[PDB]
Symmetry: C2
Subunit: 158 residues, 2 copies
């Protein structure tokens, strides 16, 4: 089933609105969004691995290409650019020209789309890669792009 993003982005809006009622502190909403993201990601990865050809890999540069060119397209209908690789090759950025989870644009500390950071961390954990994902730019805050910075921390020997 392929769908337009509109019902998705409005429903995510309803969730964020509900968490703001529930917490009335934005840093708490950010954390809750990230935790729900994580629980989503750990389930999402199994759908992904069944619908892709990556097999049993744990390479970070490959992972970046797969996230950007396959997973984002499949699950959000968009393709971010991969850029800003560290010299060491252990950090990169995903750049989007707008905010994915916002189709229709006093919470300055809120990271509106923070769920996605959780999704990335949860999904990569199930393939034995401990990663940090964070928004470092957000078009919703007046930045020129939206940027998620991904840092490879370690292989998980589970």
């Amino acid at each position: 089933k392929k769908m337009s993003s509109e019902l998705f982005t409005l429903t995510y809006g309803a969730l964020v609105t509900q968490l703001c009622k529930d917490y009335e502190n934005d840093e708490d909403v950010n954390k809750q969004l990230d935790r729900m993201g994580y629980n989503i990601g750990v389930r999402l990865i199994e759908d992904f691995l069944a619908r892709s050809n990556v097999g049993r890999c744990h390479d970070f540069r490959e992972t970046a290409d797969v996230i950007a060119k396959v997973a984002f397209k499949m699950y959000l209908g968009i393709t971010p650019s991969i850029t800003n690789w560290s010299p060491a090759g252990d950090e990169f950025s995903l750049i989007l020209e707008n905010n994915p989870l916002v189709d229709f644009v006093n919470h300055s500390a809120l990271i509106y789309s923070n769920l996605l950071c959780g999704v990335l961390r949860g999904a990569l954990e199930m393939v034995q890669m401990a990663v940090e994902a964070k928004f470092v730019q957000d078009t919703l805050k007046g930045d020129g792009v939206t940027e998620i910075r991904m840092r490879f921390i370690r292989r998980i020997e589970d």
Copy 2:
């Protein structure tokens, strides 16, 4: 942007889970789902009307065809059957062979997908039709199909 439904259904799952923490009474969750649905529907209708050819109409049989054959396809990637018309022509049912908002299957009173009832009522209200939508069957509860019953109440002279 076209996307797979997977991230949508997992995110909706996160919302429902959050409302169950927030209310710890299922009838309250149902009502909250319906109200959020309504607020979604009132926004969704403007996207729809811009992406469709229905113009300024207020006919109930036409509305049923449009909801089932156009709107459901566009926004959820599925096409329900329209059936069980009342003799008077003021009620019909939408039949789905599973539950739309569930990709991956002590809350017996919970109407898991109740958001959709709100969406339908909110959207139709903006085109001056007062409607009731309710789940009368749910595959999640062991029924053979999922069924939303739609009743035309009145033209809204606003």
